[PDB]
DNA sequence: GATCGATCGATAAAGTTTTTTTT
DNA sequence: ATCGATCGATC
């Protein structure tokens, strides 16, 4: 109940599911609680839609 | 490029008063785009240079875009592009032409060829039937080496330059450059355009018969794709261009033509011989010209100035072109919304003259004439390979009659194939197929207007006035109002016909398709709860005085004691269902039945 | 005389609405 | 444009 995406990981490497999920909610609330730390961190779902193949 | 530049240099420095009026206009369209996009919680690069400002003081500049126009565009897109980002830069594509005005005796009709200006200039007019695929094409790709972490650049040319004559490079990945990189491609920031071939007809009129409409093609880019519906009065103008290699191939190329004319152009303009721009000033005669309570009797008789009287019948005319509203039914089946009137009578009456000059103010209605082909409304799987394995559903006559009309004759003077044809397209809004590939639900809003003959004739009078040409009667319960024409002698009428044929070998039309062009963009009022009284009341008795008269009625009939005085009210241009309506729509129909 | 390399030549495509007599 | 076959040159 920590890295809620490594936790589906663990749920896969048992193989009973082989889908993972990687959204961006868990990217925006990642860069939600990214705004406070005053360095320069890129933006994600630009790059994701500017060229999505390389992701 | 040092003497082929000064030229081009010199221009460089001469048009910029050219476009001390269009210096506004190149940045100005393209603030909002930064700042549509920049704040969205989408114009192409359109730079329309009149020829009257360049030709107004230059000579040798101006003379060699209509002499060799092959060395002089990418000169003007070279100084247009270095003017937007000087304008412009701030804020973190070439801006092609579109090259509008004037030409001086080039309106080529492609019945004829040119002989002296081969790739020059031209301007060309008629009508578009092929209106082929779209599909994406590169111009350039950004290659990228993994290791090391460096891009490369790339530019594949085609025949979509236009002007010069490049050695071609029938490359689709070239991977592996000269390192030891297994190469990757940012596709994303790669670059890509589309084509769409379209064939263009001759105008039919000014064409003299001697020979069938021939027809050329020209390729277009992406700022005026999907513009053309197939049927549009279209005005084109591009380079002449040949290309391919042809009779001097590697052997045994005899008595082959190796040149395909071809025309890259801009600037597809639509006319009108959808565009009808009005000030304040004619917009506001025509509020004064609803004031009267007149102006559906004026508007009735100044239609066809060569034709006495029907007046029932040159107000239903007028009535039906405008049409009425469909209130699409939320999670039901819409109802019939269109209107859809038949003729019948005795020969040489002028049944057939009045159904031919409302093609001339049909505002893109395009009909046919009713021949007994397959086709009327379906495609049968005519593909023809769509340039060598593709299969498309080409549209014969339904992708025009949308939110338009269509006329056809001889109704009882066909076969058994379009009896089944106009069957399911009159109850049923669109068509569905699977002629030899996939169902599909394409929707068309049309409404038909019909003509056809009695058989033994002059019988009307003495036999059953219904069972009278004994086409199928599903298709006279799906229509409505079945006038009579009669024919009889008076003394008087004749008299008064033998100078109106006279007179005629020698409050007016464009002022009447712009009103009707206009009524069918506003509002529709459907609602009165007391002229909906009055109707019931007006039909209840012809329902029980329907068996005791000529002709039965059915419970659809209702339906047009609505439809009509709906349509009446939007020649008011009235926010309110009034009373008067609930009158003329009751002796139209005393006229259609008695 | 045999083996290897280079150059030149040959190899890949697709169909199904109008019109005739006839039953 | 790619693959296969034939011819020529070198070892
Ligand atoms: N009732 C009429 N009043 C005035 N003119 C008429 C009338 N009937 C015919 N005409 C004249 O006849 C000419 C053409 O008539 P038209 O060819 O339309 O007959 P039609 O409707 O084709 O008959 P049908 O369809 O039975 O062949 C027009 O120029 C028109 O002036």
């Given at each position: 109940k920590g890295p809620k995406y490594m936790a589906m990981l663990q749920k896969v490497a048992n193989r009973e599911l082989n889908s993972v999920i990687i959204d961006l909610d868990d990217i925006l609330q990642y860069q939600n609680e990214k705004f406070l730390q005053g360095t320069q961190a890129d933006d994600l779902v630009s790059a994701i839609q500017q060229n999505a193949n390389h992701f | 490029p040092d003497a082929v530049f000064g030229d081009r240099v010199r221009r460089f420095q001469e048009f910029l008063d050219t476009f001390t009026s269009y210096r506004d206009s190149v940045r100005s369209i393209q603030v909002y785009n930064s700042n549509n996009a920049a704040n969205y919680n989408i114009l192409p690069h359109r730079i329309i240079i009149s020829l009257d400002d360049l030709r107004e003081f230059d000579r040798s500049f101006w003379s060699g875009i209509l002499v060799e126009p092959a060395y002089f565009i990418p000169p003007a897109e070279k100084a247009l592009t270095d003017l937007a980002d000087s304008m412009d830069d701030v804020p973190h594509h070439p801006w092609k032409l579109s090259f509008k005005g004037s030409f001086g005796a080039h309106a080529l009709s492609p019945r004829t060829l040119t002989a002296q200006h081969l790739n020059k200039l031209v301007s060309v007019e008629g009508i578009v039937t092929k209106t082929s695929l779209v599909r994406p094409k590169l111009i350039r790709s950004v290659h990228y080496a993994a290791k090391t972490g460096r891009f490369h650049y790339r530019d594949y040319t085609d025949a979509t330059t236009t002007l010069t004559t490049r050695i071609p490079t029938p490359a689709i990945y070239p991977t592996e450059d000269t390192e030891g990189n297994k190469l990757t491609t940012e596709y994303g920031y790669s670059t890509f355009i589309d084509h769409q071939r379209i064939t263009v007809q001759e105008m039919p009129e000014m064409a003299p018969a001697g020979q069938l409409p021939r027809s050329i093609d020209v390729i277009l880019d992406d700022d005026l794709v999907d513009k053309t519906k197939p049927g549009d009065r279209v005005n084109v103008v591009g380079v002449f261009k040949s290309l391919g290699a042809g009779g001097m191939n590697q052997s045994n190329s005899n008595t082959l033509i190796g040149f395909k004319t071809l025309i890259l152009g801009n600037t597809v303009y639509p006319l009108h011989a959808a565009r009808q721009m009005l000030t304040d000033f004619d917009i506001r005669n025509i509020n004064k010209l609803s004031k009267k309570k007149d102006i559906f009797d004026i508007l009735s008789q100044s239609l066809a100035p060569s034709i006495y009287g029907h007046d029932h019948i040159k107000k239903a005319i007028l009535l039906m072109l405008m049409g009425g509203v469909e209130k699409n039914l939320e999670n039901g089946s819409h109802l019939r919304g269109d209107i859809n009137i038949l003729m019948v009578g005795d020969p040489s009456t002028a049944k057939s003259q009045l159904l031919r000059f409302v093609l001339n103010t049909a505002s893109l209605a395009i009909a046919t004439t009713g021949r007994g082909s397959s086709g009327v409304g379906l495609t049968a799987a005519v593909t023809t390979d769509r340039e060598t394995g593709e299969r498309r559903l080409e549209a014969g006559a339904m992708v025009l009659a949308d939110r338009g009309v269509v006329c056809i004759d001889e109704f009882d003077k066909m076969t058994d194939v379009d009896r089944v044809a106009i069957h399911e397209v009159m109850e049923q809004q669109t068509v569905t197929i699977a002629k030899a590939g996939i169902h599909t639900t394409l929707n068309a809003r049309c409404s038909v207007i019909a003509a056809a003959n009695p058989?033994?004739?002059?019988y009307d009078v003495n036999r059953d006035p219904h069972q009278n040409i004994a086409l199928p009667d599903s298709l006279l319960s799906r229509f409505d109002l079945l006038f009579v024409v009669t024919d009889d002698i008076n003394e008087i009428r004749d008299r008064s016909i033998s100078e109106h044929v006279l007179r005629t070998h020698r409050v007016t039309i464009p002022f009447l398709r712009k009103y009707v062009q206009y009524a069918k963009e506003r509002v529709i009022p459907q609602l009165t709860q007391e002229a909906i009284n009055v109707i019931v009341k007006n039909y209840t008795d012809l329902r029980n005085d329907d068996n005791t008269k000529k002709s039965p009625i059915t419970a659809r009939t209702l339906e047009t004691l609505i439809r009509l005085a709906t349509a009446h009210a939007k020649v008011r241009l009235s926010k309110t269902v009034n009373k008067v309506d609930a009158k003329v729509a009751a002796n139209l129909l005393r006229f259609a039945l008695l």
């Amino acid at each position: 109940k920590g890295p809620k995406y490594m936790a589906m990981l663990q749920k896969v490497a048992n193989r009973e599911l082989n889908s993972v999920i990687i959204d961006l909610d868990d990217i925006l609330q990642y860069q939600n609680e990214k705004f406070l730390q005053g360095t320069q961190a890129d933006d994600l779902v630009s790059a994701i839609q500017q060229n999505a193949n390389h992701f | 490029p040092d003497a082929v530049f000064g030229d081009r240099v010199r221009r460089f420095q001469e048009f910029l008063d050219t476009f001390t009026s269009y210096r506004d206009s190149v940045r100005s369209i393209q603030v909002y785009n930064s700042n549509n996009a920049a704040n969205y919680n989408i114009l192409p690069h359109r730079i329309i240079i009149s020829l009257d400002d360049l030709r107004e003081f230059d000579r040798s500049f101006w003379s060699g875009i209509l002499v060799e126009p092959a060395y002089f565009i990418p000169p003007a897109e070279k100084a247009l592009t270095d003017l937007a980002d000087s304008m412009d830069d701030v804020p973190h594509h070439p801006w092609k032409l579109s090259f509008k005005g004037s030409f001086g005796a080039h309106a080529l009709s492609p019945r004829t060829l040119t002989a002296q200006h081969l790739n020059k200039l031209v301007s060309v007019e008629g009508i578009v039937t092929k209106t082929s695929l779209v599909r994406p094409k590169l111009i350039r790709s950004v290659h990228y080496a993994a290791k090391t972490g460096r891009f490369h650049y790339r530019d594949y040319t085609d025949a979509t330059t236009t002007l010069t004559t490049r050695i071609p490079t029938p490359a689709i990945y070239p991977t592996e450059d000269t390192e030891g990189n297994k190469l990757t491609t940012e596709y994303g920031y790669s670059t890509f355009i589309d084509h769409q071939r379209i064939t263009v007809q001759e105008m039919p009129e000014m064409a003299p018969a001697g020979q069938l409409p021939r027809s050329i093609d020209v390729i277009l880019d992406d700022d005026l794709v999907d513009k053309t519906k197939p049927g549009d009065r279209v005005n084109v103008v591009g380079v002449f261009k040949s290309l391919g290699a042809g009779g001097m191939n590697q052997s045994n190329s005899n008595t082959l033509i190796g040149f395909k004319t071809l025309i890259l152009g801009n600037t597809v303009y639509p006319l009108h011989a959808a565009r009808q721009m009005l000030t304040d000033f004619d917009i506001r005669n025509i509020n004064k010209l609803s004031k009267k309570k007149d102006i559906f009797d004026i508007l009735s008789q100044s239609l066809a100035p060569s034709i006495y009287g029907h007046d029932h019948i040159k107000k239903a005319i007028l009535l039906m072109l405008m049409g009425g509203v469909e209130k699409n039914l939320e999670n039901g089946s819409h109802l019939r919304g269109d209107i859809n009137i038949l003729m019948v009578g005795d020969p040489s009456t002028a049944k057939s003259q009045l159904l031919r000059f409302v093609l001339n103010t049909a505002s893109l209605a395009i009909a046919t004439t009713g021949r007994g082909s397959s086709g009327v409304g379906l495609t049968a799987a005519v593909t023809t390979d769509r340039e060598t394995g593709e299969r498309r559903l080409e549209a014969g006559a339904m992708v025009l009659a949308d939110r338009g009309v269509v006329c056809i004759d001889e109704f009882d003077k066909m076969t058994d194939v379009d009896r089944v044809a106009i069957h399911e397209v009159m109850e049923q809004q669109t068509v569905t197929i699977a002629k030899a590939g996939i169902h599909t639900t394409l929707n068309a809003r049309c409404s038909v207007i019909a003509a056809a003959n009695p058989v033994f004739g002059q019988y009307d009078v003495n036999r059953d006035p219904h069972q009278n040409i004994a086409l199928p009667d599903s298709l006279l319960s799906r229509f409505d109002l079945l006038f009579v024409v009669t024919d009889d002698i008076n003394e008087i009428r004749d008299r008064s016909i033998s100078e109106h044929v006279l007179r005629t070998h020698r409050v007016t039309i464009p002022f009447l398709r712009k009103y009707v062009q206009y009524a069918k963009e506003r509002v529709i009022p459907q609602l009165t709860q007391e002229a909906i009284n009055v109707i019931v009341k007006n039909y209840t008795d012809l329902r029980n005085d329907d068996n005791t008269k000529k002709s039965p009625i059915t419970a659809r009939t209702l339906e047009t004691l609505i439809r009509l005085a709906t349509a009446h009210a939007k020649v008011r241009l009235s926010k309110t269902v009034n009373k008067v309506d609930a009158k003329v729509a009751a002796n139209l129909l005393r006229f259609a039945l008695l």
